[PDB]
Amino acid sequence: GWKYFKGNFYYFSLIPKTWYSAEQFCVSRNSHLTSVTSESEQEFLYKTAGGLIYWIGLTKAGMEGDWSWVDDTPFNKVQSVRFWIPGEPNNAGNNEHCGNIKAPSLQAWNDAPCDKTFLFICKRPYVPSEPSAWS
Ligand SMILES: OC[C@H]1O[C@H](O[C@H]2[C@H](O)[C@@H](O)[C@@H](O)O[C@@H]2CO)[C@H](O)[C@@H](O)[C@@H]1O
Ligand SMILES: [Ca+2]
């Protein structure tokens, strides 16, 4: 059930999980909750989501509380400003440390409590099967 888009496969779950249980599901499938690194990718994701809320790999790290991607793609603050829902992230109740895709629009992300259960999106790169590149 993996959908393909620009060198990566994506899994849109049918079962809701907490953010971390979702990530552990993705890891069990050789993947991670999805990063988003371009306008086209954001579009593909929100359109495929179709108005339902999905956990993505957005999560807080480091002492300052900076947003980051669980797949370890460096988080580009500047290029991601357009991807949040207006007025987010707002840290409602000071307990919103994970992020989801929410609105069906380029401005789509909300921060939400990590312990809430949502559907979720996994992402894994296509890696072709080739012999050892060492020698
Ligand atoms: O308006 C943006 C805001 O909406 C959500 O807050 C909900 C909450 O989840 C409900 O349980 C209930 O208390 O009503 C609220 C509407 O004000 C999101 O939780 C929040 O992160 C989001 O920013
Ligand atoms: Ca929020």
User: Residue holding tokens 């990718």?
Assistant: 41
Going from the Cα of 119 to the center of ligand 2, the distance in angstroms, rounded, reads 17
Determine the residue of 91, 110, 111, 116 to mutate for testing ligand 1's pocket, defined as the one with the most ligand atoms within 8 A of the Cβ atom: 110
Task: Please answer whether residues 108 and 42 qualify as being in contact, where contact means their C-beta atoms are separated by less than 8 angstroms.
Answer: yes
User: d(Cα 45, Cα 12) in Å, to the nearest integer?
Assistant: 9
Query: Which H/E stretch holds residue 125?
Result: strand 119-125
List, chain by chain if needed, residues with CB within 6 Å of any ligand 1 atom: 88, 90, 92, 96, 110, 112
> What would be the CATH architecture of the domain defined by 1-135?
Roll (3.10)
Method of determination? X-ray
119-125 and 54-61 beta bridge pairing: parallel
The two tokens of residue 106 are: 């380029």
CA-nearest of 114, 87, 77 to 99 is: 114
Letter for the amino acid at 97?
Answer: H
Task: Please answer whether residues 13 and 119 qualify as being in contact, where contact means their C-beta atoms are separated by less than 8 angstroms.
Answer: yes
The domain segmentation of the chain, as residue ranges, is 1-135
Q: What is the resolution of this structure in A?
A: 2.3
The two tokens of residue 38 are: 């371009």
